[PDB]
Design a protein around this ligand. Structure first.
Ligand SMILES: OC[C@H]1O[C@@H](O[C@H]2[C@H](O)[C@@H](O)[C@H](O[C@H]3[C@H](O)[C@@H](O)[C@H](O[C@H]4[C@H](O)[C@@H](O)[C@H](O[C@H]5[C@H](O)[C@@H](O)[C@H](O)O[C@@H]5CO)O[C@@H]4CO)O[C@@H]3CO)O[C@@H]2CO)[C@H](O)[C@@H](O)[C@@H]1O
Ligand SMILES: OC[C@H]1O[C@@H](O[C@H]2[C@H](O)[C@@H](O)[C@H](O[C@H]3[C@H](O)[C@@H](O)[C@H](O[C@H]4[C@H](O)[C@@H](O)[C@H](O)O[C@@H]4CO)O[C@@H]3CO)O[C@@H]2CO)[C@H](O)[C@@H](O)[C@@H]1O
Ligand SMILES: *[C@@H]1O[C@H](CO)[C@@H](O)[C@H](O)[C@H]1NC(C)=O
Ligand SMILES: *[C@@H]1O[C@H](CO)[C@@H](O)[C@H](O)[C@H]1NC(C)=O
Ligand SMILES: [Co+2]
Ligand SMILES: [Co+2]
Length: 434
């Protein structure tokens, strides 16, 4: 797709700190850009939509190539249309915003310039950030993660995409998402099937795969840390059900691991560590600091800070595994106790290390789940299982929670605020900001 300018594109600025092993941090100035799926896609020569509701224009988009040729992505009114605002080192995303039409959340990428994404090499470094999840009830997910996306949004590899990072193109993740309207400079109209429950969405014949480091997926009830390896490290297109993931019938018939080696303290047995109020170690009604370290062995460490008190990731005992570090022994023990082979089938942490060794783009989003109501994160899943089933209970939310239409109606003013991002060598982000 190309870019159009009926509506100006002004990326909300966002600063972050780059820290050094020497003990000092220096402020960096970037900005955020919303994913292309949220935008108005219209004809290059008029205001006629190429996509509207849950269907593509049969005339403007008779096939993937013709569609990309005739269509362009336009600018976004961040605050008024998408409820996305920034202030210094803080970024806030509202759940439901009402303008000409209704909008639910957003998926944003941190930029290096107005036309390129910022890339981060996680291996040997640590990433720190503050987050307020107080306004995130059951069924919602304020996520902060990294994916192996191209810095230009795919423009160099696919010339028919001239919109680029400036218009949030090029997304990919471990689900090999097939809901994306444009992949590899072509539309996804071929094989398009509208969603049963989401008026704005559908599933196309193509998906976009790549490694994903889910640093944070959480609400005020539950939180999870999850690395997801793929046989192909970076962005790569996939065909239909061979994509696997959430958008396919068979989630494991692809190149990426859709489950990952997840670490949810509650799921692992510590039901008193993270939650709303003073009865939890970390009180989710208040802002907290989350630090994630990627040691060169490929293992991942984690600690939190709230009110000046530091807490390492709680210890967990699963099978023969015991400790608080997410390493090979943990991931293997998890598959043994909870079940599954997706993570190891895709290469485990060794394969995942190939992603953290290279550059990855920072993503910040707020979403509700039209496929599983976020039950996998904060409730019992599958819903017919009990606490006797290993790993089934992940949170205290009712198995009836998270219906998108219900939560959007009941908690429209829900939101998430990510702030004070700091990145640098392990042991450096806790030093004074510049
Ligand atoms: O009035 C302006 C202009 O509006 C045009 O219509 C727009 C409308 O303004 C937008 O609000 C709307 O935005 C929705 C997208 O259409 C839809 O694709 C997207 O779908 C989300 C889904 O809701 C969400 O659950 C899913 O979550 C992912 C997370 O983002 C990731 O972080 C996580 O890892 O994985 C989950 C699961 O995949 O993401 C998908 C997108 O990939 O939801 C948007 C918000 O509701 O788009 C409309 C266009 O389709 C209108 O056409 C113009 O005429 C008008 O001028
Ligand atoms: O894409 C959203 C989100 O997904 C997260 O991954 C989730 C999966 O979405 C979810 O399906 C998965 O649930 C598994 C569970 O982990 C298994 O332990 C369990 O195992 C079953 C087994 O399949 C059966 O054969 C056997 O009879 O019973 C056992 C026990 O019930 O199966 C369920 C699925 O039915 O959990 C994953 C982790 O929460 C990603 O981690 C996240 O990043 C994504 O955003
Ligand atoms: C949960 O983790 C906290 C922090 O490590 C610890 O103090 C507490 O004892 C743990 N509780 C349980 C039930 O494991
Ligand atoms: C839950 O339902 C699934 C699908 O029928 C089944 O495989 C599983 O054994 C059920 N669990 C219980 C505890 O009934
Ligand atoms: Co094809
Ligand atoms: Co270690």
């Amino acid at each position: 797709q190309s870019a159009c300018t009926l509506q100006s594109e002004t990326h909300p600025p966002l600063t972050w700190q780059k820290c050094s092993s020497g003990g000092t941090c220096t402020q960096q100035t970037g900005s955020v850009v919303i994913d292309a799926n949220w935008r108005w896609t219209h004809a290059t020569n008029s205001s006629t939509n190429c996509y509207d509701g849950n269907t593509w224009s049969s005339t403007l988009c008779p096939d993937n190539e013709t569609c990309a040729k005739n269509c362009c992505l336009d600018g976004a009114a961040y605050a008024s249309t998408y409820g996305v605002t920034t202030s210094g080192n803080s970024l806030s995303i509202d759940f439901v915003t009402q303008s000409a039409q209704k909008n639910v959340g957003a998926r944003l990428y941190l930029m290096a310039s107005d036309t390129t994404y910022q890339e981060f090499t996680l291996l040997g470094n640590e990433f720190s950030f503050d987050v307020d999840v107080s306004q995130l009830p059951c069924g919602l997910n304020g996520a902060l993660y990294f994916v192996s996306m191209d810095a230009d949004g795919g423009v160099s590899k696919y010339p028919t995409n001239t919109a680029g990072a400036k218009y949030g193109t090029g997304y990919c993740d471990s689900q090999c998402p097939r809901d994306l309207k444009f992949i590899n400079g072509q539309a996804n109209v071929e094989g398009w099937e509208p969603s049963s429950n989401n008026a704005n969405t559908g599933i196309g014949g193509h998906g976009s795969c790549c490694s994903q480091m889910d640093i944070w997926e959480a609400n005020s009830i539950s939180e999870a840390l999850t690395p997801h390896p793929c046989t192909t490290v970076g962005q790569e297109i996939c065909e239909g059900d061979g994509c696997g993931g959430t958008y396919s019938d068979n989630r494991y018939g692809g190149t990426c691991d859709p489950d990952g080696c997840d670490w949810n303290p509650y799921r692992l047995g510590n039901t008193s560590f993270y939650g709303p109020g003073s009865s939890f170690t970390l009180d989710t009604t208040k802002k907290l600091t989350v630090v994630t370290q990627f040691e060169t062995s490929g293992a991942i460490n984690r600690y939190y800070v709230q009110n000046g008190v530091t807490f390492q990731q709680p210890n967990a005992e699963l099978g023969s595994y015991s400790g608080n570090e997410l390493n090979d022994d943990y991931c293997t023990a998890e598959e043994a106790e909870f079940g599954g082979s997706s993570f190891s089938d895709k290469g485990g942490l060794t394969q995942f290390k190939k992603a953290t060794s290279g550059g990855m783009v920072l993503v910040m989003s707020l979403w509700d789940d039209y496929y599983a109501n976020m039950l996998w994160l904060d409730s019992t899943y599958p819903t017919n299982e009990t606490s006797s089933t290993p790993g089934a209970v992940r949170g205290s939310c009712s198995t009836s929670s998270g219906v998108p239409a219900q939560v959007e109606s009941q908690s429209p003013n829900a939101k998430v605020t990510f702030s004070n991002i700091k990145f640098g060598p392990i042991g450096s982000t806790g030093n004074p900001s510049g």
